[PDB]
Ligand binder design. Sequence first.
Ligand SMILES: Oc1cccc(F)c1F
Ligand SMILES: Oc1cccc(F)c1F
Ligand code: SF4
Ligand code: SF4
Ligand code: SF4
Ligand code: SF4
Lengths: 445, 419
Amino acid sequence: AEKEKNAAEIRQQFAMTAGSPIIVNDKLERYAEVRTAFTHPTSFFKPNYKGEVKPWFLSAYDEKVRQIENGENGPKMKAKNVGEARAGRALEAAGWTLDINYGNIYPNRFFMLWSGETMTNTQLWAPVGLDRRPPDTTDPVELTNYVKFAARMAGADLVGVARLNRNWVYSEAVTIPADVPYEQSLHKEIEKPIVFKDVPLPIETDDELIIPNTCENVIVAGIAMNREMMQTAPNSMACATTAFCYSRMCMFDMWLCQFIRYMGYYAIPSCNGVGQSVAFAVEAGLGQASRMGACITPEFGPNVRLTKVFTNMPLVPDKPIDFGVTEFCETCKKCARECPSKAITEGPRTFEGRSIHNQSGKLQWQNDYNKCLGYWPESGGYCGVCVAVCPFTKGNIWIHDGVEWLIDNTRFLNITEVWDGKINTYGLDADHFRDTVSFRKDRVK
Amino acid sequence: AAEIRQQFAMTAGSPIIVNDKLERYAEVRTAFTHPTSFFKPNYKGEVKPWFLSAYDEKVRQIENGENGPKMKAKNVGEARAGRALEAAGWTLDINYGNIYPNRFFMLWSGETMTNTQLWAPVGLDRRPPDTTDPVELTNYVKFAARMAGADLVGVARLNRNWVYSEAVTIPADVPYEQSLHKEIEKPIVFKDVPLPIETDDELIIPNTCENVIVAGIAMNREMMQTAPNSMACATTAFCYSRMCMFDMWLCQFIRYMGYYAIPSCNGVGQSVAFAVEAGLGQASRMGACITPEFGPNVRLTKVFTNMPLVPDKPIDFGVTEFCETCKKCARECPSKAITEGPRTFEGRSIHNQSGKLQWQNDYNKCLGYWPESGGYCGVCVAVCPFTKNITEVWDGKINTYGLDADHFRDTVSFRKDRV
Ligand SMILES: Oc1cccc(F)c1F
Ligand SMILES: Oc1cccc(F)c1F
Ligand code: SF4
Ligand code: SF4
Ligand code: SF4
Ligand code: SF4
């Protein structure tokens, strides 16, 4: 008979021995965040459909407007009517409500405060003194169970812990000066170094963002996106599940940082800022790196967003996982073949970046992320075709052969219906939600 | 669960029985806010705002290694963790409930929000609606509501009887750090105006504001069953922040569809009445809306809008007749706040709205137990048949947002059950 799926068993079966799985060489340096395609001057500008050169997201706005006027849900993709086209973009735009300027990357600004002191919640609770009382628990085992339980309350579908590898922390962040109001933010962005110093608490000076040398650990969360909506990539409903998950990330960071602070430790939120989420997720055992470049998880494949929190709270690091992704990506190449911009390489992994947007010195598939971003104004969205076509995104991949779990190799061989179809709270799917049930034994060993 | 809900659909019409004495209720009359109930002694005999006296009890409990009143924790560390989780859960909530309208997270226009500003070149909030069909709009907005974190969603015509006559708020330029000391009353009125607007004198809801969308946000059963101890406080708190995110997300969706939207959380009006009229559940002896999926172990929020929508039908699955003979909450209530008598139209005190048929409870007695116990009690929710130690909770089953995969299939939704 069919053995019922057991996600905890799967992770136990594929657990590796301790050690960062990412292979590096001597040319590895920390990466300046301004080099990402979203921010770098070589890639930031893209033409719109009239040939006007603009910040990429403004060119994409132009395409969204054109699609709604023409009753389309995506490039060359007719909607049922203009109202359906309108509804998809209204859902997408609303999803971003709790996210600043597409990713919350400015450290210690807006929602990403590095101290809780000025928050309305901290002020309301100040008489209890939870953020000023020394920790009552220093045992990493108990702290790991407490913080992972809190992480699930805070909206994580996956959570893992790693020691902080500074190689993945940006050498300089993109931010804004502290006196700049929101309406000027996009015009006043600056770079600011992230440094590690012997100080008691995270602190920002005029010159530096300072992380304490005591900042030992990173907690990584996976925030699951909706399968049906992502499968509409590159059209608007894939944009909407992306957007809503960014606001879920923001809530997660603030909730968890406050819990950690109220336990007597400090906590640094980040969302898409501070450092490279995929590398942290791999080191924390959420999944493995992939050809497309994302972290592929056993539960969701790559169809999951990542955020992370940095802390001095003593914790037990999780073990990395190896469930064969590297070997499958070596022969699969579906994302590379379906990529509308040919951004994803079909070749082997190397240590040599394809362009300024890649960090050299770590073994990975090297993709051209300027080509990727170029498709976003063209399509009026955030694409996601690679996530959508990846076999690991299917809910169907795990089988048990009577002895152990394995991947089913057979897997690698419209929007109106989405609006009219299955949905549940936060876009989670009750057919798979048991996969993320958690007891103490899977939170800490 | 879609089976049961249409099996128990009533015909259209508000099921709340009223008389000609009914008047709209001033929000300041709630036990949280009224001067006769706001101050309570702490365990040392010092009289303070009730939540400050409760704070003193939380500190005393942590020091004494307790998770609740006379409830020893495994150690001081466990006691601390429960209160840290509780305090963190409130991160996206202002002053216990987000009640001040058109302040902080509860803005009545999206125009100044960072998200609206970023999206302004697209013009979604300025473009006339492309859809005016209430059937399609009901399907769209309910789908959005599930994306926004509602476990239940319903629609009713707006009954102004349940809108507060006057809100508790603060002056618009008062900074957060002075908010608790500068609360004021302000009338909520309905006028022929295009958009929701606030003047120096009034909160003005348009006469075109036809509908209310009510969301149920499920609490965690294991944690609520620790009532009156700290983990019940934590699931309460996290759900208040889920309420706030729901309101903001859904208001933005409605605005980007070409309509206006008023968020509320615990402000603006009486959630239980709206929830009953929108078919989420039935009123109960304890006073909560009891739902088939969660019983009373579910939080409520609501959004008011001129968006054309199809009202849901009220539901009758026998709660009234069950509460008539049960009385379990009334017998377990640590403060004897809940009546064992029959329903009447006459409030027991200033905290009740007279003129509607309900079980009349003494809500000052309830609030009095909160500083004593250092929490938000919830024993009534925990013991209710419809709802069905702390170390075992921390070591036990949990899942995303505290939802339970053993029951999460009950809130799956297709178009057939949305409209
Ligand atoms: O604008 C964005 C859209 C989707 C994902 C991102 F990280 C973005 F910055
Ligand atoms: O349910 C609540 C719990 C604590 C404080 C409040 F104001 C509430 F409304
Ligand atoms: S589509 Fe294939 S090659 Fe690309 S990331 Fe997925 S498994 Fe790897
Ligand atoms: S998001 Fe689209 S354009 Fe970018 S790599 Fe994936 S498939 Fe290619
Ligand atoms: S919350 Fe507690 S004190 Fe209040 S009515 Fe319920 S059981 Fe009674
Ligand atoms: S405990 Fe019994 S009387 Fe009280 S609300 Fe629940 S069913 Fe009704």
